[PDB]
Structure formats: C-alpha cells, structure tokens
Amino acid sequence: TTDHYLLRLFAIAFTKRRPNQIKKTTYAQSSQIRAIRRKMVEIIQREAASCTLHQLVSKLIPEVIGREIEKATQGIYPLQNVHIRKVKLLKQPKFDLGALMALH
Amino acid sequence: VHYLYVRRHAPKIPTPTDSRSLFVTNVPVDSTEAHLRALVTSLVGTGRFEKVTFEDESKQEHSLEGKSIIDAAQGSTAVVLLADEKSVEQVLKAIAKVHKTKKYPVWGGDGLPDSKMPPLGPVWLKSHNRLSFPDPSMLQASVDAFST
Amino acid sequence: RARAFVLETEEMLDSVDLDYSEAFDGADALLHRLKGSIETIPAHDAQPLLDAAAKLEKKHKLKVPFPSPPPPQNSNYKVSFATPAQFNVVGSYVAKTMVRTQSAHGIDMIVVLPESILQEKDYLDLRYFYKRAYYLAVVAAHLQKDLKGEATLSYEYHNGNSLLPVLSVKPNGEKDEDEKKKKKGVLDYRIRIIPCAPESFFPRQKLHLGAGLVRKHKEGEQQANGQPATPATPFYNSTLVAESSYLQYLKLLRQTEKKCAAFRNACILGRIWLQQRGFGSDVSKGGFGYFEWAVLLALLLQGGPADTKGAAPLSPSLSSTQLFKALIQFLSVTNFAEKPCVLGQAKPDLAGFIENGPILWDSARQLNIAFKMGPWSADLLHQHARWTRKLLADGAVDQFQPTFILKADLPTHTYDLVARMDPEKVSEAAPDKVAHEARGRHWQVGHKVYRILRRALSDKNMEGGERARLIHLKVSPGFSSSSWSLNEKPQPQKAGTPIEIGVLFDPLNMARTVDRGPSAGPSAEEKETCEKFRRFWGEKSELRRFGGDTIRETLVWSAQTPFDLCEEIMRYILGLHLRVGQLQDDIVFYGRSLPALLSIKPSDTALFNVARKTFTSFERDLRDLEDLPLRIRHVNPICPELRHSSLKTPSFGPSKSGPRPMEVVISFEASGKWPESLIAIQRTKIAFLLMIGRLLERFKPGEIRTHVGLDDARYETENLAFLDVIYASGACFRVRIQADLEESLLERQTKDKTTEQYLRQRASTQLASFRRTFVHLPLHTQYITTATTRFPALSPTIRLVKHWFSVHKLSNHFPPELLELFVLHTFLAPYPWDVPSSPTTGFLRTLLFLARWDWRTDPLIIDTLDAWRKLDPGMQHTVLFVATAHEQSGTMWTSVDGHPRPSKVVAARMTALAKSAARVIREQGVDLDVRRLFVPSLKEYDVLLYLNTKVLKSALRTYITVDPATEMNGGKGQEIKFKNLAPETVEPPLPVAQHPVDVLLKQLSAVYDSAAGASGTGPLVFFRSDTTATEEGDKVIGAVWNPTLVKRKWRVNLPTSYKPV
C-alpha cells in the first residue's frame, strides 16, 4: 500500500451453482480456473495498491472487494461467493504517532 | 472624459440575430442597457434601443482574460442592437453630431458626463452571497430540469 | 561523481593557485635578509629579573609576562640571551600547500633556543616560559635596533594561545624587488617570529597530560595513591610539549607529504573546509586548523582502524578527492570528532583505534593535539563531518558550492551577555581559585559557562533516552583582540567580556514543558543533590508524577508566545550561577498573527482539534456511512489546515477568514452514467451534492448547516458548485466531487478548435489548473503533512514567509504551493546550512536564498527544463522553476497561474525586496529595525489608491480571531466567542461580514490586465487584510501599466482604456 506496508491478501472463491440446471457437478475447466485466479489477482491488486491502510480496512469491513471480484469474474465463470479469508501485515516500517493519533 | 469608438456592424452581418448593430470599442465602466438607453435618450432625435449583446466585460480593472470568452461546454467590445433602420440611422446621425461637437462653437463642454454605478458594499456582498449561498429553490429547479 | 569532483577540484586549484614570483623572490629574499639579521643579533649575559627590568624600563621595547608575572620572591633563576641555535620554517610554506587567501596568512618562523641556557627544572613553575618571554624581548628589541624603524612590527599570540607570545612582522610598502613586499597578501602579508624549545629537553613522561606542572600547594598534595591530588594541567603541558616538538612534527608532515602524492591538495581542500566552517587552529574556535588537519591526514595515512590496518581509502598513491572524503568519513564516524571527547582515542604509528579516554594522542612526543579541542567545537565537527559525509556520499546533485556556514554557533537566538567580572569575589557566584587558575588557561569562565548552559539545557527521559533542548552550544568572547602593541605587557581591555551564546536546538525538545529530573528514592541520590538538579536549580525543582507511574523531581515551564523556555532557563541560570550579568535577545518574529483561543498561543492543537478532529467527527464518518445511489470512495481535504501551512492557525468560528472555507475533493466509484458534456457532468455533480445536503439537513446532525455555492477561480466554467458546510463548532468546509472523465474532457477541449489557432495556451492553462486543484493539491497535502511532522519549524516558517508576502503584497500573484515548496526546499535541501529548528532561522534562510537565487540558470528541484528554458530565454512567462518527483515539469504552479513577468512586476519585486531585506539585515544587523523588513516601501508604483472600508472598531481582527488593536479589551483572555457568530441567516448579515478589498480586488483582477496590473492586500491566498488593517499596513491598490503600452495603432484586439491622437 501507499504507507510502505507490505501485506498479503489471501482470497477464496466458491463456484456458483446456476439456478435452472440439472447437472449436479459445477466444475470449471483448468483454463477457466487459471483465468479466474488471474482476474482475482488483478482486481485485488488494482483495488489494494491505490489506497492507504485505513482506506483498505474501510474497504475490508463491508466486503467491497469480494463484491467487485464477483462483478468482474461472473463473465468468465460465475462465483457463488468471494471472501478475503486472510490479510497479513508483514512489515511495518514507520512509527508515525501523528497518523496513529489521527486514526484514534 | 471617456471616449467611445463607434462603427457600424452592417458590413459584417451574415447572421440574422445581429442586424441593425453598432460595433463599439472602449465602452465605459459598468456599462449596462439602462446607461445605453439613457445614452440614446440623451441623444437628440434618436429612437429606441433593445439590448446590449456581447457584454462579457473586459476592461474596468485587471485580468488574464474575460469570464465566458470560450464556450467550454461545446477585447472589451459592445454590440449595440437597435430596433429599426430608422432608429439606427438616427442614432448614427446623432453620434456623428456628438463626434463633431468637440469643436462646437459654444464650447466642447456640451458632452454627456458619464455617470458610473458605484459598486456598493451590499451588492458586493450580494455577489458574495452568490459565491456562498445562492437560492436553493432555483438551484433545485434548474438541476431537476437539466437532469430530467 | 568521482571525475566531476576531480575536474572541479582541478579548476578550484587553478583559481586559488599561487605565483612563483610572489614566492621567489619576495618571501625568500626577505627570509634570507631576516635570517642574516637574526644571525648578526649578538648575545647577552646572564641577568635576573631585576637586571631584566633595569634593561627594559628605559627602552620603548618591553617584555611580555603572561598571567601571572614572576615576582622577585619567586624567581630564583637568571635569564640570558645567546645566539639563536636553530632557524627554521613551520606552517605550510616549505610544504608549498598554500593557496590564494584574500584576507591573511602567516608563515611561522621558528627560533629554536640553545640547550645550555635552561636548567632541568625549568619545566616547573612557569620558569622556561618567562625565560622565553625575555628571549623574545631581546630578539625583537635588537630586531628593531637593526631594522632602524622601517617596517611594521606588532605583538601577537600563536593561534590565540595565552602562554605563547610571538612577534608579527607586516610590510609597510611594496616595490619591484626591494625589501618592501606589501602587495603579496598570502605568504607575504605577515611573518610570525616564534621562540621555541629544542627536542626532548624536559621529561616527556612529566609532560604527560596526567600531571600538573605548576606546584602551588604542598600540604595535602601527597598520600593520595599516586598523583590525583595535584590538578593536572593539560593546556600548559601541551603548550610546553608542542613548543618542544614543533620541529619533529614538521619532519612528520614532510615525510607524509613526500609519501603521498595528493597530500598537498588534500590539505588545500581541508583548509577551504575549515575556513568556510569558521574553525581554525585558534584557541577561541576549537584548534582544529591547518596543522591539525594535516596531522590527522598523516595519522590516518599511517593507520586509524582498530586492528592497526592501513585504512582502506587512504593509500599514499591515491588522489585528493579520496583523501579528503576519507578524512570526512573518519571524522564523521570513527574516533576523530566527538568520540575523542566521550568514547574513543587515537594513537600514532602504527595508528589504531582505542575505545577509552578523551585524547588525540602522540606517544612518541607525549603530546595531545586536541588540547584546544573542546567538547562544543568537537561535536560541532562531528555534525559537520557527518552531514558532509552524507553529502559526499550522495550521487545526484553537484555539491561543491555547498560549503557549510556556522548557523549552529550564530543563530537567531544569539544571546548577548553583558557581564562584568570585577571584583571576582563578589561579581561571580563561582570562586576563581589557584587550582582553576592553574588548570584553565584564562578560558576558565568560558568553560564554566559552557558547562552551566549544557547542564541547564539537558533533559533526561525515564527510559534511558538522553535528549536535550539543545544539540550544539557555542560561547563566543565577542570583540576579542589577538594583537597588542609592543609597549604593553598583557593585552589591555576595559570594555569587559561580551558573551555571544549560539545554540542549535532539538526541535521536538525545544518546547517540552517539563524539565525532567532523576527518580527520587527514599533517600536523595548523588545526582538528585548534585550540580545538575536541586542545588543547581534552587526554588524551581518540584516533585511531579507523570503518567508513566513514576514520580520524578522535575521542573515545569509555561508556554508563551514571544520567547522560549530556553530564554527563561538561560536568564535564570545566568543570573543565578554566573552573576546578575544581563541577557538580551529581543528579535521579534514570534509576534505574528496571534489566534484567539485559551492559553494563547497554542501548540499543535488548533490545527488538529479545530479542522482535523472536527472533520473526522462529524463530517468524514457521516458522509462515509450515508447511503447514496453511488457509494462514496474518496475524501481528501487539501487544505493548509491539514498540511500545517495556513497563515493563521484555525480557531472555532471565523467565517470571516480567508483560509477557513476548507477545500475538500471527493471521488466516487467508477460509473459511466455521467454524461459527455461539461454542463451535464457538473450539474449531475450538483445533484449528487444536493442529495448529500438533503440527507445532512434531514438527519439528527441537522444542527450542522449546509449550503451549495458556485466557484469562480476556475475560469470559463459556470457550473462548479461546492457544498460549503458549517459544523456546530463553526467549522466551514468546501465539498467538491471529482470523477475520472474530467481530465479527459479537458483533454478533449485542448484537442479541439485547432482551426482558430489561438486557444491552445489558455486550454492548456485551464487543464493544468484542474490538475493543480483536483489531484495535485491532495497529493500535496499528503506529502506536506508527512514532512511537516518530521520538520517542526516548517509551520511557523511558512507562516512567516506568507506574512512577509502579505505585507509586501505578493501572495495574490503567487500561489501558496510555491511558498510551501520554497520553505520545503530550505528545510529539506538545507545545504549548506542546517535544518532550521528556529522559525526566524528558517525565515532568514528563505530570504537569503531568494536574495541569491538567480532564477536564470538555476531551477529549484527538491526531494519530497532544458526545453522550457530554450523556449523562453527572456522568461516573460515563468520566473521560478520548482520541481519534485511529485511534479516534474516545474509548470503546475507558475505558468498556469500565469504571472506577468517583465523586469517591473510582482516577481521582480519579490527578488528585489529579497535582496533589499538581505542587504539591510547585513548592514543594520538584528534589532528592533526589522519593521523595515516587514513594512512595504510602496515605491515604483504608477497609480496607488488608498483603500479603507466601512467597518466598525476592532474589525475585522476580533472575527478573523486575531488580536492586535488593543481597543478590543482583554485580548490576552477569552473575551471573544463565536457561538453568537454562528448566524441566524446564511443570507445577510452573514455575507456582510466579508471585507471589500478582497473581492473588489478579485473582480478587479478578473476584468482588465491587457492595460495595467496592480498589487494589493486582497486576493493574497489564504489571507484577509486584518493584520494589515493596523499600524502594520493599509489597504492599497498599486497599479503599473504594462510595458506593451507606450503607443499603438488602432485595432479591435486592443483591449485598453485609450484616447486618440
């Protein structure tokens, strides 16, 4: 992010079962799966490298990112639900008490 | 003494909305339609006056350029629009008479004294109320009519 | 960097080189003749003090007894004058590392005395030194006797050392080849005759630092397990041993200059360094001079690392840049500037690094080079060497013209101390006794006051963190003369000793209200009862518990506007422990526009609580949580009330103020329903803003008032309408909406209408105006807040320079981003000065850099071109070219505002007033006459209109929340309040409150300029004319006609008020 915070986002997405279907298995081909993961990496990076950590968590609370992932990936394959299951801040390089009390 | 440069716009009218017109450079300060109708009324033997077009004023005090010189959506010179060919020819004769009165045999003091509208505190701060709080009634009506 | 440094050092030595004709034959011919003269000087017999007096009372020549003079009840020896044993040269002449100095330089002549004259006890009790005084008396007496009275001679000290009296010859005239040599001013301006001791006469083990070599007291001086009872005298021991080992050090320097090729130019660069630092070999400036630099070069060539390794970037075959930069690095970190005071020591060949004891040592001669090296100048050298190592380690910008200037010892808080030390038993709180008289060489009171300012300005946290309210200290004995005439024995003075206190401050510790102590236990500790605390402080020490759950015997200071807690501690500690001796520094710069709050003036609280905290609660969270057709994405206040750069810090209420309408840009999410025309775009923006205002005016936060209003600063677009909102704390904000298609819509507008051919520059102008006011000010306020946290004086410095531009009527034509980028240059690229911890220091550095900033060839690129310069060689369009990694073209803040810039406009007035303020702060000094620097001259204006407006008394100041004009009673207190200023009508009388000069001048300045252009007080950015409606100003419209109007032919694209001829 903008504040030099390196972080890892692990997102998980389950395939949609389409209404009015009879086939029990909703499998996607491996090309579709790799394309969907590519779109997922693109969407997460594009909506996590533009903002700050406070804006990132203000995005994480109402789950906008999974919504935008579903909205942009339903054209290649519909997804039942997209969650961000892990967010790990790896390195914090600064101690800005100004920004800290600005949050608080 | 403020001097007006008045020419005819007749050699350059292709458009219908700008016929019977005077092209006037170096217009006085705060020059509005009331002062221009007072001008043509102070002129002897002159008819009636309609409207000042192209009044996006560019003199009285400093600037880069005017206000609406460009049409962003898609030379301070006045364009005086008369009523009829009789009115425009009589205001031409009268302003030629006023031009010749600099050497008038009584004296050169018979010209009209240009009375300006002094920009008051209240109208200055009315422009401030235009900057800050215009009328929300007209704002809502205009935005709904342009949004529909 | 390497080849650039090599070529520019070559050009520097080509500039500062010397002439061989000036050397031979001026210096060598008169050296040969003065050698023949000192050879024909004849000897004189063994005389006591009484015979010496009977010899020199009848002569115009007299001796020189240093304090103290020997009495006949103590002087048991007898003094004589033999033939001079050895005549030699010391300095830089025989090394030929001299360069072209304009001021002065003196080649040291050394008259090494014979050996049979002195006795093996003469090193004790000042005996050899008085013998040296009588020797120089006879030498210079017969010198004038043989010179018959043709040349100028005077007495001096060698490097201000009080215990080494010398003679100084200066030529009176000049000829071609005769014995008059005035016209050569470096090696021939002065010649320094110095008596010196032979090699290894007195015991060098006795000449160690650890022994005291004058014996004053004898009872109680023993049975103390060795010799700690005798007070060791490092200065006097080092004087004896340096006089005795001047010649061997000439041999050492000679062999190192032979071994290293670039040694000469290394000392050249170092002498340029010390002369620009102000440092030298004098005892009043730390003693780090040319010989100390050369001997550091020598020891660092012959070692210096811990394992006696020959140091890596100092092989004797290397170049001058490598040697100089390596001495810079080793003086910067290892054991050579402040570590030889606190932590480390040096040793000679084979040189190594040893981490105990403060000495700069030579064991072959038993000598400390650092005997003039006090801790203050030592740490001064440490910061200079570390900062210059950072510079000479940087690899981007050329850095030869930055050579340091001594702000750390001459800042704006240079305290004049007028104190009189007579009589010493009453006129000083510390007794000057025989022990201190032996120990210190007449810098005793200077050393005592050095230590008392350190222990008054030192802080100590509970967690072991040692910080102080100072970083560097300097005590200067002003008007100190190093020369006295032949006829007087000491240097006579009757005007006293003025002390100049110069401090470089810690900025985060300059305004901490607590003066911390030690933790107080059940019994008082040695530090609790020592000379740092309760006994040194007196009544001011008090027990205070902190939130860190630990009691401490602290002291508390009170926050005041026009001065500092440093001023309070300095006046109290000097009036207490030195004497009543008066302290003055009355430089009035904290007296700017003072806000209206509780406990005036506030710290960084009216910038957080008033705008930032009020915009967090309630504005940000409400507009984040509120529900819309299109959800919110981004809210960025762009304001100086965020980035700490408003001229007046915001208080509660003032709708009358300039910077109070607080610009906030807001971005939505991505959508396409926005249309493709500017009018439909911006009216749908107003529709979204309208439903925002509807929810805010319906909700329980309905006490917050809201309204929509147009904009005019962005030209030719009649549909910019922002939400001006007033919080119940009187907190006023401008809310605008920014989408992604507006930059491309103005790209379209710049692209079309190519056929007319004359609209492209104004289309680029409006494009980059949008660019400045919708994304670049957001990024600007982000970066400048993150830098203003780490730079504390940047906020009062931008306040100061904005107030100067406001009283000189310039900040309407100049936008504030340029002002903050200029102070951001002078704080973040502060070379070759320090980062200003003082606001007046930052302001004087701004004024000096603008007085010297030749805007033709040098642009300002800061760390937070060759096409624009070839397109404008005359610079009719841009005067200042300021770039950053933020904005690279240098055009977002000058060309787009579009300032008229011939030689007779506001910008030329800016640089000319900068040169004028610099010149008057040069020839008048720092006093109460800075009202010159803050009153405009109003000269070179064609038509000047004096405007005063329709206001009552105390207006507008009490409603801009500033308090000059004492007709408003109680400005020191909270007599003024603004919850009655929150109006009942947003219609008049709320816009009644504004002042005519601002928007009169604005609409003025939006109709003509093709005829003339004026400066005034109105549209000065983030500024109302309140403080300039006082004795500090007026309202003026000063207009100058453009140089394109003298006469012209009639044409319709004329516009100007013109009359026919």
Helix content of chain A: 40-55%
Strand tally of chain C is 29
- Continuous helix count of chain C: 25
Instruction: Identify the quaternary structure here.
Output: part of a larger assembly
Derived from helix and strand composition plus strand pairing, the structural class of chain A reads: alpha+beta
Number-wise, the strands of chain A total 2
How many individual helices of chain A? Answer: 4
Spatially, the strands of the biggest sheet of chain C line up as 3-4-7-6-5-14
> What is the rounded Rg of chain A?
17 Å
PDB class: ribosome
Keywords: ribosome, ribosome biogenesis, rRNA
Entry title: Cryo-EM structure of the 90S pre-ribosome (Kre33-Noc4) from Chaetomium thermophilum, state B2
Chain A: 40S ribosomal protein S1
Characterise the protein shown here.
The PDB classes it as ribosome. Keywords: ribosome, ribosome biogenesis, rRNA. The structure is cut from a larger assembly and holds chains A (about 100 residues), B (about 150 residues) and C (about 1050 residues). Chain A has four helices and two strands; from the N terminus they run E-H-H-H-E-H. Chain A has helices at about 30-45, 55-60, 65-75, 95-104; strands at about 5-15, 80-90. The longest helix of chain A is centred in the middle third of the chain and has 17 residues, at about 30-45. By secondary structure, chain A is α+β, with helices and mostly antiparallel strands. Chain A is about 40% helix and about 20% strand. Chain A has a two-stranded antiparallel sheet with strand order 1-2. Chain B is α+β, with helices and mostly antiparallel strands and about 150 residues long. Chain B is built from four helices and four strands, in the order E-E-H-E-E-H-H-H. In chain B, strands 1-2-4-3 form a four-stranded antiparallel beta sheet. The longest helix of chain B has 16 residues, at about 85-100. Chain B is globular, with a radius of gyration of 19 Å. Chain C has about 1050 residues and is an alpha+beta fold. Helices cover about 30% and strands about 15% of the residues of chain C. Chain C is built from 25 helices and 29 strands. In chain C, the strands form eight sheets. In chain C, strands 3-4-7-6-5-14 form a six-stranded mixed beta sheet. In chain C, strands 20-21-24-23-22 form a five-stranded mixed beta sheet, with helices on both faces. In chain C, a hairpin with a 7-residue loop joins strand 5 (about 150-155) and strand 6. The longest helix of chain C is centred in the last third of the chain and has 31 residues, at about 760-790. Chains in contact: A-C, B-C. At the B-C interface, helix 3 and helix 4 of B face helix 16, strand 22, helix 18, helix 25 and strand 28 of C.
